[PDB]
Amino acid sequence: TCPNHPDAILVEDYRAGDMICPECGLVVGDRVIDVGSNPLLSDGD
Amino acid sequence: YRHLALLCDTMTCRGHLMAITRHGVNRQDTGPLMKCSFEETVDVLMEAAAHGESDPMKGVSENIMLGQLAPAGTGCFDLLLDAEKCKYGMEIP
Amino acid sequence: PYANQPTVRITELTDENVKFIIENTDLAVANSIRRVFIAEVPIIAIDWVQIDANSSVLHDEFIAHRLGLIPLTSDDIVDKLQYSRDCTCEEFCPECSVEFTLDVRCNEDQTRHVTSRDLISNSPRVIPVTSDDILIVKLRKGQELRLRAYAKKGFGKEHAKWNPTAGVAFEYDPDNALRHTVYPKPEEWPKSEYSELDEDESQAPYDPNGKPERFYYNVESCGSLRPETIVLSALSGLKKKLSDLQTQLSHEIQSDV
Amino acid sequence: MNAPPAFESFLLFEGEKKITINKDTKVPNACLFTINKEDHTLGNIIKSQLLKDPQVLFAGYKVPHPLEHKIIIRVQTTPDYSPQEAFTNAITDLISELSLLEERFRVAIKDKQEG
Amino acid sequence: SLKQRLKGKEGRVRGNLMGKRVDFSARTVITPDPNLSIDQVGVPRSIAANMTFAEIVTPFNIDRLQELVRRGNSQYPGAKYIIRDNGDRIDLRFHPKPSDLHLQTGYKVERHMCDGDIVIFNRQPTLHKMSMMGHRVRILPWSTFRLNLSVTTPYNADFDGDEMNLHLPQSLETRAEIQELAMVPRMIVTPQSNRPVMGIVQDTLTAVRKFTKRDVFLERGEVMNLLMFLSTWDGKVPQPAILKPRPLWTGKQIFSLIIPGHINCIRTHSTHPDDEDSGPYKHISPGDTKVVVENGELIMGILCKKSLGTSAGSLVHISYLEMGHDITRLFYSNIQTVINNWLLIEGHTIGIGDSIADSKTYQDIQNTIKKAKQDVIEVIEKAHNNELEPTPGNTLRQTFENQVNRILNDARDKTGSSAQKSLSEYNNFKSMVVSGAKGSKINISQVIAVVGQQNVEGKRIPFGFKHRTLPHFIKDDYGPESRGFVENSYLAGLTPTEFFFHAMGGREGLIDTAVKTAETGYIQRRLIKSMESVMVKYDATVRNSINQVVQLRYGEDGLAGESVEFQNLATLKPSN
Amino acid sequence: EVAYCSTYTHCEIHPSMILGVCASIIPFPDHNQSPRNTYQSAMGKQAMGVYITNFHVRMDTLAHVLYYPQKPLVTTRSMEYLRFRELPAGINSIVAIASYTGYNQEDSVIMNRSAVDRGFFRSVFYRSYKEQESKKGFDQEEVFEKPTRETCQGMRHAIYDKLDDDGLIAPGVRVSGDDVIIGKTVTLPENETKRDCSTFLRTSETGIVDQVMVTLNQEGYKFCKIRVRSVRIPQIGDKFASRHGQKGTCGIQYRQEDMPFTCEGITPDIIINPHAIPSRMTIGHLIECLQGKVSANKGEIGDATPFNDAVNVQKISNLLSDYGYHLRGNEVLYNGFTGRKITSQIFIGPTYYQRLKHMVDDKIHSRARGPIQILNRQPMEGRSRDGGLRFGEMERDCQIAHGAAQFLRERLFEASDPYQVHVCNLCGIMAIANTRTHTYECRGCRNKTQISLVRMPYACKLLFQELMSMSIAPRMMSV
Amino acid sequence: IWGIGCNP
Amino acid sequence: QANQKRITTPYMTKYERARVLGTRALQIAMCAPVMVELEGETDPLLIAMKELKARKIPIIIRRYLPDGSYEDWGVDELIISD
Amino acid sequence: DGLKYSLATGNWGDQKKAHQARAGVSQVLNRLTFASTLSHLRRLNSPIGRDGKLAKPRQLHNTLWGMVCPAETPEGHAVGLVKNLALMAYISVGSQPS
Amino acid sequence: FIGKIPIMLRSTYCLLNGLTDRDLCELNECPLDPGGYFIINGSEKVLIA
Amino acid sequence: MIIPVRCFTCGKIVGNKWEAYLGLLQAEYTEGDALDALGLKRYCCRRMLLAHVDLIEKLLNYAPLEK
Amino acid sequence: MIYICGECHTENEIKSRDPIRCRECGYRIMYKKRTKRLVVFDAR
Amino acid sequence: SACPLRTIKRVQFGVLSPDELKRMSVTEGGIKYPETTEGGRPKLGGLMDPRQGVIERTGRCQTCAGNMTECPGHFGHIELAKPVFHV
RNA sequence: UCAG
Ligand SMILES: CO[C@@H]1[C@H](O)[C@H](n2cnc3c(=O)nc(N)[nH]c32)O[C@H]1COP(=O)(O)OP(=O)(O)OP(=O)(O)O
Ligand SMILES: [Mg+2]
Ligand SMILES: [Zn+2]
Ligand SMILES: [Zn+2]
Ligand SMILES: [Zn+2]
Ligand SMILES: [Zn+2]
Ligand SMILES: [Zn+2]
Ligand SMILES: [Zn+2]
């Protein structure tokens, strides 16, 4: 969602954890990876 | 001798021997957050809440916790801009 | 204010050793010659290896390392060869390199010793000092090693694979007379092979006027270069370094003024 | 991972000067020479030959850091002599010594073989 | 539970608020570097490339920052990011439009860490204030932090796998704070003991003792080379001490050029004879002791740990007190460089020749041990006959142990003194002990003469088995060998029973180290917590956070601890 | 003899059997200080060597194997039963105990770079990565395949070209840091396509794939183990130790021309500081150097059993005197740079040195604006997670002593967890705040006008909210 | 390791 | 407080010097006018040091006494600790 | 599963009950070097808690002559609490007293 | 069948017991390997006494 | 694992001498006599042959991964 | 996509989502074969 | 952002009033549902309330447009049927 | 389980 680039696919990054417009390099979302973080048996308990 | 004398003066300042322990240090009437950082923690906070204690925010640890500039050195004073001196001198840029 | 005129006597000259005495020279010049023997005499050795198949127990970079350390005859071709950086062609060409190829498979039950004799060079002059053999790897039955390698000119300052010498022996003042080393107990120390003293006297009497001179050398070769040729090439290479310095210094002197 | 390449010790990178001559303000008739991508080999010979010259008052060489590759040579000469002249003359004398040594070593080789 | 989260260490109160993990910090192994100055630290290029310091674009620095932006992350002196006025961050790694690369005043370019960037260097545990000091950065081409050897003493760090933490200040304000309060030259002198923290150490101390001997004479070329490594040299060669027959300088004459400015100091060498001061030759010292520096020139004396070490009145301490912190930094660095380049000419070593002593000395040591064992036997026989009389306040067992230990200790010390007599001038163990660089007289004694009595829990080796120390000894054996006396030296080699008893003693040492670390850590934390907020107010009263007056003036005289020095009153002692 | 005991009932087979497996490799243990033998027992466990002869078959995480192990020149008799000769861990190295350039000071070591070039103390590091294709999920299947950026909605920008069709990188392909070793895809339930689940190489591994194996594990799912090989040439951070408790890193590496040389041309492979020996009193190191010189010349492996009484320093010295060297092992050395004889004669001899597992490449970490933790929104912890170093409480106390209040503030607030909250002026409790809507309101007061922005660490916000959940009200009032 | 008054 | 009856030390404390130089340097980096003529000095901190030597830094230090009063010392008025 | 669990986890007991479980048994074998493998196999672990700093269980005892190595102990918080058998030491397997 | 018991390697009940060194090589097991460890869930575990 | 080419300290080629050393040892030469006969004179070179452990034979005992 | 087999050392091509079992031996431990692309090794 | 930046000069500690807890909590009527998931993911009046805080790192909580960073979280209340001593 |  790069403001200057309507419908631009933002490349994910691992080094700082942000999605960056590949044609201009703008960092959209600063630190928005963080850490990013049995259903089979039974059900909700 | 300055460093020995300061410890002895802090232990005997109140008039009763203040042990350097949770009991002696926490009994003194410092701020609740500062007491919280040393040993007792949650119990100190609960007692302070019950009695409506207010933290003066004059301590170093209390200001460190809240992210404010500590009252330690380089924080004791507040710098102000001097307009008259700004006008004077050669303002090259 | 001028250079001393040195002299040379060659006491021993064999296929793998040269012993000579340089006289009427400064210590700094003699030590720098010794240093150039080790680090600035060019030789051809393997620096590029592409391994097609390696079933041996040793991994691929192990084989590459051992191949690099194998000495290659560089007696006369090394002067003709150019450094790979100097050559205009991309990567390696016959003017800037020598191509070695090795293909060995063990089909017999007996263990096959892959030796330097199995290294095959496209250029006849450069051969792995074979004319036993250096063991590259041992192969069990059903194990195969096939690789292609190129050899480049270089000197020992880059890598020890390009070190022409085995051991350069440098000694001056064999009987301690300038007292450069002060023995706590003079008697215990073994006498030098070059010492001229009688058995009774351990050290020569101190000579305050004397300065280091008559340096003794013993240069041993790996077989990459003739031991005489190591010494001659070192003298020539040090002379070339000084001449390049002189050219650049003249440029700087003229440019500043 | 941070290891420098081996060729960096003797190869001048582009835009690097082999010799740079900077005068020394502290003392008269003194120049400080900086040689790049060189080691004790060249520095010791040059300093020794400079010390042999009667008009050279000071001559020393210094490697500022072993991990870096640079020689700093300080030469101070008497008035009526220039430090740059002393450096050039030192190099010529060393070249003459080395050429004479090569000739005599070749003669010794030829005499040892078949003689 | 909530209380469980807050209460414990690593909880929000302490593990996440009082201390916390931080950005812009790096850690790697430390290795030595004599060539770096005191304040410089050698940072690897990868660590330098990851860490970035944001620089505001000004009209003055727009060109330099533009070049850094053009270089990008790949080339080392590059910029990782561009921060615009709007706060938008343009990561240069992913392709930025050529329009974005253009810079205007107010943009903040995040350049890679460059030479000269002030950082804070830390080694855990951070016991005292000198364990975090501000260092200038010098980028060198390998992957270890490289610090000068003198700076090891404040950090209590050696290069045997140690590691240190590098924190880069990210603002000009905090960078100025470090530069003007926490740099290494500013903290040479500790307020704790009003002594210098850092002193010449290891090779440079050992070699400065040898350099400063009367014997050392340097020829012209060696003087040239030594003066080359002196950073503050005036360019004027000192007139040689011996003009004829051959011009020959002296070690003290060159060291006088290292000494900063005009510093006056009188100290005594470690081997100074006590009778020398009273007797003649007090000023013309026969052994070249009694270091005297007048007008910043070393008139006489042999330098050692006392003159150049971390003690009050040292030459380094007088330099900091008189010349200032910058000149003292240069003093430390020049001592190291010049002396370490002379040590290439002289050299140092430790070998077996140093451990071995004369045959007469070995016989004397053996005779002392024989008569000591006989004395212990006589004490034992007196005890068995009950002739021994108890010392007041002690049981007969305690007084027997006292007398036996006294005999064995006197024998041990006498053998040690015989060994120390045997040492020659050339002996390198003695060189290191005399200079103070490493070792002690005790170590020499144990190496050469006698390891000594092995004590555990303050007593001789106890009777672990029933009434005997080891199964090889007979029951009820209070003799010297049975209870742990190690007659052999390390060079001679311990007999098996002595090996086991020595292992018992060494185990006690190891246990004591491990226990002391934890207990001392707790004490130190409690002291800091009790006194953290006390500070000198602008009234110059010392007050806590509550503003209660702890002291009306700091230290009762209102002076700081680093400036003060030891002095004698001289009116007190004399008679009327 | 003179009667001590005439009733011995048993006799020891040999006193050296009191030592254990790791202490039995120490030569001349009785000539060392006790703490130093204890330290060597721990260092010998961390040395590098061929751990087992079937190491090629095994796929173990963190396996180091030395290129050219050598058996000790000075060995104990009990080492034979420990099989140390069969699988040695270390290389005999010509060691000089000298002060050369100041880079061997403290415990560091000057190493010969030319020797390092010729194979000296070179090792291989194998790291194995395991992945399991788990189909246990009800609608989740972790299939092995090469993820495609267009096909997989979840993906990463690291290199995926290396992966073959099976999703496993082929052996013999170089892998740099942040490359995809194994590519795995979890099919995504379409609650209303793909969350990437590949495994990435540890940063700075920089190895070549050695073996790739595909099997079925105990659970029957497809199991893949990939082993990556990295050669490790010794550097100026690596830790080397002898058998006598002397550990130290590599201070610097000098080429053969620069190292000091004897008259024979022998240059030390390792130079250790003379200052290590005296305080530590590891005389066994010196006796091992002397016996190693004698052994190398004689051609027989020396005997260093702890308690012998037939091997003395004097006997070793006389033996060395026979072979043409100084009896105490000292040798006249020449300075490599200038060629002048060093005035002191340096103690040179062969000594078994080991290479410890601790290497600088594995221990170097740098952090700058990396990922943050979920709970505290603070920097992560650990080199693997790109974590920042902790600024502990002792560190903050040192900074308080310094008087550097603003560095303390940056380090403890701005560098770690900066955050902003909105706090009601009338009541200290935090207030709801919609920045995009620009309407800021406080519940409990029905007051919108009186709200103030407060900058506090996120950990402090979490602490205050955890106090609130305990019914404690931390009312922070700006007034 | 020395004596009773020294170190272990 | 009044300008008269100033009881604090005339000498500038070390902490005041650190904070004044850092603050003035940050101002200079933000394109604030520089009173002292710069002899080719581009680094903001070095320019701030030059200004401090010339006593032309336009900052007045407000020193808080423990009783709550404040004394305002201009940077010029304070004697530099150096 | 009981045997496999107690071996893999290192907790000596049952899965449901960890109150009486003793941790530290069944460690992963060290394979850095053959010496490390051998020493790991011949290792003794004293049950005294590491946290307690009382020094009596840590000191080398006279009765460890020939049974336990005097030198080989971990240096750190477990000095003297982890011990290695001597070379000739042999622990008894056990027999009936009948 | 009442369960399965983990088997310490090179004990009497292991497959490797009483195998000549050549046979151990044929099974890709080292002749010098000491034994004395359990292979539980694919990792070698050692019971510390 | 295999005899190193080029003795570490000096650089003499020692890799061609391992099989000859073993053969001389079979011929009942003492280890010192064998080293003398092979021409290894400096103790640095003799350390290489004397202390070498040839593990590559033990590794060759295992069957090849691919036949 | 050619896997060498541990037990009998015979290469067997295996398609995607196909059981990992070597024909002619039945062993379930396969090794991927060495890549065709070649890596330059510096002999250094 | 319009609110002025202020630094805390005093922290007042006190027991939270039950009436104040009722008013302050965004959840109304209390947490009626032990289950955290309704309509698949979100359970209004449950433990995981969209109004209480931001979920899934991409959603916005109902009370404010947090986007997982701006929102500090908002408290909820459970009305205990019978009072319970605070430990 | 190691590293200080
Ligand atoms: C010198 O003191 C240091 C420090 O105090 C720091 N340190 C180390 N371990 C710990 C620990 O567990 N807890 C805390 N808090 N600090 C610790 O390490 C101490 C020494 O230990 P060592 O005695 O082994 O140093 P060698 O004498 O052994 O040095 P060689 O010759 O090997 O290089
Ligand atoms: Mg250390
Ligand atoms: Zn864009
Ligand atoms: Zn070409
Ligand atoms: Zn409100
Ligand atoms: Zn050799
Ligand atoms: Zn098959
Ligand atoms: Zn919200």
Q: Which one of C160, C194, C211 terminates a domain? A: C160
Look at chain E and count its residues: 576
Catalytic residues of F: 107
Tell if the CB–CB gap between D6 and C36 is shorter than 8 Å: no
Of the candidate CATH numbers 3.40.50.10540, 3.40.50.300, 3.40.50.720, 1.10.274.100, the domain formed by E202-346 belongs to 1.10.274.100
Identify which of F46, F106, F107, F395 to mutate to test ligand 1's pocket (most ligand atoms within 8 A of the CB): F107
Both ends of chain A: CA-CA distance in Å? 39
E109: tokens are 């370019």
Q: Can chain K be said to touch chain L, i.e. do they have 3 or more Cβ pairs within 8 angstroms?
A: yes
Resolution (A): 6.4
CA separation for the pair B40, B23 (Å, rounded): 9
Distance from CA of residue F337 to its chain's centroid? 34
Structural domains present in chain K: 1-67 (1.10.10.60)
| Count of Cβ atoms closer than 10 Å to residue C206 Cβ | 10
- Give the domain extent around C102: 43-160
CA separation for the pair L31, F211 (Å, rounded): 7
From H48's Cα to the closest Cα of chain B, the distance in A is 14
E450: tokens are 């006698």
CB E457 within 8 A of CB E450: no
CA separation for the pair L10, B85 (Å, rounded): 89
Tell me whether residue C128 is exposed, middle or buried, using C-beta atoms within 10 angstroms of its C-beta: 0 to 12, 13 to 18, 19 or more. buried
From I28's Cα to the closest Cα of chain J, the distance in A is 4
| Residue in E29, B73, E431, E296 with CA at minimum distance from that of residue H64 | B73
DSSP code at position E504: H
- Strand N closer than 7 A to residue I75 Cβ: yes
E426 contacts on C by Cβ (under 8 Å): 184
Encoded amino acid at E483, one letter = R
CA separation for the pair F74, C111 (Å, rounded): 32
From K10's Cα to the closest Cα of chain C, the distance in A is 5
CA separation for the pair E541, E535 (Å, rounded): 8
Buried b (16+ CB within 10 A) or exposed e, E136-167: bbbbbebbbbbbbbbbbbbbebbbbbbbbbbb
DSSP code at position F17: G
Identify the H or E element spanning H70.
strand H70-74
| Count of Cβ atoms closer than 10 Å to residue D6 Cβ | 16
Encoded amino acid at K58, one letter = K
| Count of Cβ atoms closer than 10 Å to residue B87 Cβ | 9
Beta bridge pairs of residue I85: I68
Radius of gyration of the CA atoms of chain D, in A: 18
| Residue in C170, C163, C29, C43 with CA at minimum distance from that of residue F113 | C163
Tell if the CB–CB gap between I37 and J34 is shorter than 8 Å: yes
CA separation for the pair F169, F178 (Å, rounded): 14
φ/ψ bin of J23: left (φ > 0), alpha (ψ from -120 to 50), beta (otherwise): alpha
Angle at the Cα of D67 from the Cα atoms of D61 and D69, rounded to 5 degrees: 50
| Count of Cβ atoms closer than 10 Å to residue F311 Cβ | 16
CA separation for the pair E511, E517 (Å, rounded): 10
CB F270 within 8 A of CB F93: yes
Tell me whether residue D106 is exposed, middle or buried, using C-beta atoms within 10 angstroms of its C-beta: 0 to 12, 13 to 18, 19 or more. middle
DSSP code at position H12: P
L24: tokens are 């002619």
Q: Could you tell me which chain H residue has the CA closest to the CA of B81?
A: H59
CB C173 within 8 A of CB C194: no
Tell me whether residue F348 is exposed, middle or buried, using C-beta atoms within 10 angstroms of its C-beta: 0 to 12, 13 to 18, 19 or more. buried
The nucleotide minimizing the C1' distance to residue F45's CA is: N2
Angle at the Cα of F76 from the Cα atoms of F73 and F80, rounded to 5 degrees: 95
CA distances to C51, C181, E117, F256 from F93, rounded to whole Å, are 32, 25, 40, 14
CA separation for the pair C23, E447 (Å, rounded): 46
- What's the CATH code of the domain at D25? 3.30.1360.10
Which chains are adjacent to chain J, needing at least 3 Cβ pairs under 8 Å?
A: F, I, K
SS3 label, residue C21: strand
C141 contacts on K by Cβ (under 8 Å): 64
Does residue A40 have a known ligand-binding role? Answer: no
The pairing of beta strand F346-355 with beta strand F330-331: antiparallel
Q: Are residues C218 and C178 part of one domain?
A: yes
The reply to whether omega before E245 is within 30° of 0 (cis) is: yes
- Give the domain extent around F407: 383-470
Minimal-distance CA residue to ligand 1 atom 13: E517
Q: Can chain F be said to touch chain M, i.e. do they have 3 or more Cβ pairs within 8 angstroms?
A: yes
E215: tokens are 């014997």
Q: Crossing angle, helix D83-112 and helix D40-52, to 10 degrees?
A: 110
The pairing of beta strand F91-97 with beta strand F346-355: antiparallel
CA distances to J26, J30, J32, J41, M11 from J23, rounded to whole Å, are 5, 10, 13, 25, 78
CA separation for the pair H66, E546 (Å, rounded): 10
Q: Which one of C108, C135, C160 terminates a domain? A: C160
Is E557's C-beta closer than 6 angstroms to any atom of ligand 1?
no
CA separation for the pair C249, D85 (Å, rounded): 10
* Binding-site residue positions of M for Zn(2+): 61, 63-64, 71, 74
The torsion angles phi and psi of E404, rounded to 5 degrees, stand at -65, -45
Distance I82 CA to N1 C1' (A): 13
Identify which of E517, E519, E520, E523 to mutate to test ligand 1's pocket (most ligand atoms within 8 A of the CB): E517
Q: What CA dihedral angle connects D92, D94, D97 and D103, to 10 degrees? A: -80
CATH architecture of L1-44: Single Sheet (2.20)
What one-character-per-residue DSSP string does chain I give? -HHHHHHHH--BS-SS--SS-BTT-SEEPP-SSHHHHHHHHSEEE--S-SS---SGGGS--GGGTTTB-SS----STTTTTEEEB-SS----------
CA separation for the pair E196, E192 (Å, rounded): 10
Contacts of E104 (CB under 8 A, 6+ apart): E57, E62, E85
F213: tokens are 């194996």
Q: How many domains does one find in chain D?
A: 1
Task: For strand N, list residues 5-64 of chain I whose Cβ lies within 7 Å of it.
Answer: 24, 27, 30, 45
HSE-up (13 A, CA, CB side) for residue L26: 0
- The verdict on C222 touching K (C-beta cutoff 8 Å) is yes
Handedness of CA C144, C147, C153, C159 (dihedral sign): negative
Residue found under tokens 């602008």:
E538
CA distances to D40, D56, E224 from D48, rounded to whole Å, are 12, 11, 11
This structure was determined by cryo-EM
SS3 label, residue E341: helix
The nucleotide minimizing the C1' distance to residue I82's CA is: N1
The shortest CB-CB distance from E177 to any of H22, H42, H63 is to H22
CA separation for the pair F93, F338 (Å, rounded): 25
Provide, for chain B, the percentages of residues in helix, strand and coil under a 3-state DSSP scheme, each rounded to the nearest 5.
Answer: 45, 5, 45
Q: Which one of C119, C140, C160 terminates a domain? A: C160
Is F247's C-beta closer than 6 angstroms to any atom of ligand 1?
yes
Distance F123 CA to N3 C1' (A): 20
F255: tokens are 């080429």
DSSP collapsed to 3 states, J15-31 = CCCCCCHHHHHHCCCCC
Which chains are adjacent to chain F, needing at least 3 Cβ pairs under 8 Å?
A: A, B, C, D, E, H, I, J, K, L, M
Minimal-distance CA residue to ligand 1 atom 22: E513
Identify the H or E element spanning C36.
helix C27-39
CA distances to F207, I27, L39 from F128, rounded to whole Å, are 12, 20, 21
Minimal-distance CA residue to ligand 1 atom 20: E513
Ligand with an atom nearest the CA of residue C93: 4
CB H44 within 8 A of CB H26: yes
CA separation for the pair E3, M86 (Å, rounded): 13
The reply to whether omega before F171 is within 30° of 0 (cis) is: no
SS3 label, residue E339: helix
Q: Where are the beta strands (DSSP E) in chain C?
A: 7-13, 17-23, 43-54, 98-105, 112-115, 120-121, 135-139, 144-154, 165-171, 215-221
CA separation for the pair J24, E257 (Å, rounded): 73
CA separation for the pair E547, H67 (Å, rounded): 9
Structural domains present in chain H: 1-82 (3.90.940.10)
Q: Where are the beta strands (DSSP E) in F188-307?
A: 194-196, 199-200, 207-216, 222-232, 239-242, 247-254, 270-272, 302-303
Helices (H), chain H: 14-29, 44-54
M58: tokens are 């991409």
Q: Could you tell me which chain I residue has the CA closest to the CA of J41?
A: I8
SS3 label, residue C239: helix
Q: Which residue is nearest to nucleotide N3 (CA to C1')?
A: E161
CA separation for the pair F351, F92 (Å, rounded): 5
Tell if the CB–CB gap between C239 and D98 is shorter than 8 Å: yes
CA separation for the pair E92, I5 (Å, rounded): 52
CB B39 within 8 A of CB F393: no
Which chains are adjacent to chain K, needing at least 3 Cβ pairs under 8 Å?
A: C, F, J, L
| Residue in F296, F304, F350 with CA at minimum distance from that of residue F84 | F304
SS3 label, residue F333: coil
HSE-up (13 A, CA, CB side) for residue J49: 15
Beta bridge pairs of residue F447: F442
Minimal-distance CA residue to ligand 1 atom 27: F280
CA separation for the pair E504, E485 (Å, rounded): 12
Tell if the CB–CB gap between L29 and F215 is shorter than 8 Å: yes
CA separation for the pair E165, E23 (Å, rounded): 12
| Residue in E44, J25, K64, E132 with CA at minimum distance from that of residue L7 | K64
Q: Where are the beta strands (DSSP E) in C27-156?
A: 43-54, 98-105, 112-115, 120-121, 135-139, 144-154
Is E125's C-beta closer than 6 angstroms to any atom of ligand 1?
yes
CA separation for the pair E459, E505 (Å, rounded): 11
Helices (H), E295-395: 305-308, 315-322, 325-346, 352-355, 359-384
Q: Are residues C165 and C155 part of one domain?
A: no
What ranges do the domains of chain L cover? 1-44
J41: tokens are 């869930």
* Binding-site residue positions of C for Zn(2+): 87, 89-91, 93-94, 96
Distance F42 CA to N4 C1' (A): 14
Is E158's C-beta closer than 6 angstroms to any atom of ligand 1?
yes
DSSP code at position E14: I
Identify the H or E element spanning F74.
strand F74-75
Contacts of F284 (CB under 8 A, 6+ apart): F26, F27, F28, F29, F30, F31, F32, F244
| Residue in C67, I26, C66 with CA at minimum distance from that of residue J40 | I26
* Binding-site residue positions of E for Mg(2+): 158, 160, 162
Residue found under tokens 């195998």:
J19
Both ends of chain J: CA-CA distance in Å? 30
What one-character-per-residue DSSP string does E151-203 give? THHHHT--TTT-EEEEE---SHHHHHHIIIIIBTGGGSEETTTTEES----TH
Is E160's C-beta closer than 6 angstroms to any atom of ligand 1?
yes
Q: Are residues C242 and C176 part of one domain?
A: yes
CA separation for the pair E530, K50 (Å, rounded): 65
Most L-contacting residue of C54, C58, C65, C145 (CB-CB within 10 A), to test interface: C65
CB F282 within 8 A of CB F245: yes
Look at chain D and count its residues: 115
CA separation for the pair L30, L13 (Å, rounded): 11
Look at chain J and count its residues: 49
Residue found under tokens 């807890």:
M21
Tell if the CB–CB gap between F403 and H14 is shorter than 8 Å: yes
- Give the domain extent around D73: 1-115
Contacts of L38 (CB under 8 A, 6+ apart): C50, C51, C52
Q: Where are the beta strands (DSSP E) in F405-471?
A: 420-424, 432-434, 439-441, 451-455
Q: How many domains does one find in chain C?
A: 2
CA separation for the pair M36, F401 (Å, rounded): 50
- What's the CATH code of the domain at F416? 3.90.1800.10
Handedness of CA K15, K20, K26, K31 (dihedral sign): negative
Ligand 6: centre distance to CA C45 (Å): 20
